[PDB]
Amino acid sequence: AQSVPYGVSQIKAPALHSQGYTGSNVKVAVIDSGIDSSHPDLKVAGGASMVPSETNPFQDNNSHGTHVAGTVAALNNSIGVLGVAPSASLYAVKVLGADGSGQYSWIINGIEWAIANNMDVINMSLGGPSGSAALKAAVDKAVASGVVVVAAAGNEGTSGSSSTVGYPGKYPSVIAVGAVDSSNQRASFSSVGPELDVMAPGVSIQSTLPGNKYGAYNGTSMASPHVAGAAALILSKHPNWTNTQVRSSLENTTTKLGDSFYYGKGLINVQAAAQ
Ligand SMILES: [Ca+2]
Ligand SMILES: [Ca+2]
Secondary structure (H helix, E strand, C coil), X not given: CCCCCHHHHHCCHHHHHHHCCCCCXXXXXXXXXXXXXXXXXXXXXXXXXXXXXXXXXXCCCCCHHHHHHHHHHCCCCXXXXXXCCCCCEEEEEECCCCCCCCCXXXXXXXXXXXXXXXXXXXXXXXXXXXXXXXXXXXXXXXXXXXXEEEEECCCCCCECECCCCCECCCCCCCEEEEEECXXXXXXXXXXXXXXXXXXXXXXXXXXXXXXXXXXXXXXXXXXXXXXXXXXXXXXXXXXXXXXHHHHHHHHHCCECCCCHHHHCCCECCHHHHCC
């Protein structure tokens, strides 16, 4: 029996599926802890590992990358869940180890691999409080090259008037994704600040876990993949659009929620964004 996670319905992905757009031929890189190739509800197109001690990117020792991948593209079949862009070409770019941490160079190496391999979209459901010159140069190179770069905003809540958006979401060339619950209210852990761009579901997100399992997580790392999947739906309908066009449409077609400090432009609506 397959269920459609509510977060998928919440951004209006099913209306695109009904028009016949499911993300076909769009290459999405999941830059995370790897993707479990043994999961029957995922189809992996390729990948690479930048973690020297964990060289198989098809081995997810943290569970995180597999869950993120499932939100992007869990297959439309008879089991499990349904991703935002079920027909997208999924790449496992492993940059995080079994403990969930990763060095900045591994992450940069992974962004470089994605550009070289002509990824359409990159999802980075990770963040740190400190940026680096080389990390910024690498995201900038992705966007300059035409890739859509999506990242979690961070789970640092608020801190008065300070921005709590982590890196790389804090950079202007990246789309930073905060999380709302099912009633469109921001999750209390959702980072805020001027660098916050858009919101997506990130509370009790049911997705794929390693070992042919399913389970829910909360966090802006679960909001992110919704937007990456939306970008893949847009590109399946308008393959000629640039990342400039995709980012613009996503931000110009949101459902306004509250004050941008807390909500960015609002909740994405992929049905509107796709034109
Ligand atoms: Ca499924
Ligand atoms: Ca940003």
